Amino acid sequence: SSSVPSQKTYQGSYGFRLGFLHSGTAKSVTCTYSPALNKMFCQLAKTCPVQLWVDSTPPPGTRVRAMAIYKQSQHMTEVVRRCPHHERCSDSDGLAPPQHLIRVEGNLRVEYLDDRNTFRHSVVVPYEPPEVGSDCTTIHYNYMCNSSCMGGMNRRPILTIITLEDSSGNLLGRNSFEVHVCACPGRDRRTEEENLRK
Ligand SMILES: [Zn+2]
Ligand SMILES: [Zn+2]
């Protein structure tokens, strides 16, 4: 059949897992995470904090990669990409190729990959140990297209897969979370958690 990027949780030797801010569901929130759904709700192009927690520190040369896949089997082989409309947005970023859905902000060492063999997009930064006074490292992602964009995800659910890898790309750890990009993430989180209850 067709191999797809794995989404299996794997903490690895460093005890790698993800954390998310406790941001609430008010109308004004821009990024919010549901532990009931393991799902991030966030606004187009806004900052999405993703914490990296480890029990011990990965070595220099370790990198952290992010890639989106469609959640549903019948769409899983389709590369997740930004819609043609959003490709044309004007911003201060001088690094991300216009087709990439996921960007990293605030990191001058970011690299973007358009895999020559799988065609998948990903965004990768060097792993760094927590800043002074912090217990975790955070990476700040932006999602550059809405769930609703007809020329992109077109309402199909996606997951983001975060991989910890060595300098050669070998697996050191993996986690994932669903993400819904939308104008009203607090309202959407509230709706979906209410659906879940029912
Ligand atoms: Zn625009
Ligand atoms: Zn779009």
Residue numbers in the entry: 94 to 291
From the manuscript:
The tumor suppressor p53 acts as a DNA sequence-specific transcription factor regulating and activating the expression of a range of target genes in response to genotoxic stress. This in turn initiates a cascade of signal transduction pathways leading to different cellular responses including cell-cycle arrest and apoptosis that are known to prevent cancer development (1–4). p53 binds as a tetramer to specific response elements consisting mainly of two decameric half-sites separated by a variable number of base pairs. The majority of tumor-related p53 mutations, particularly those defined as mutational ‘hotspots’, occur within the DNA-binding core domain of p53 (10). R273, a DNA-contact amino acid, is one of the most frequently altered residues in human cancer (6.4% of all somatic mutations), with mutations to histidine (46.6%) and to cysteine (39.1%) being most common.
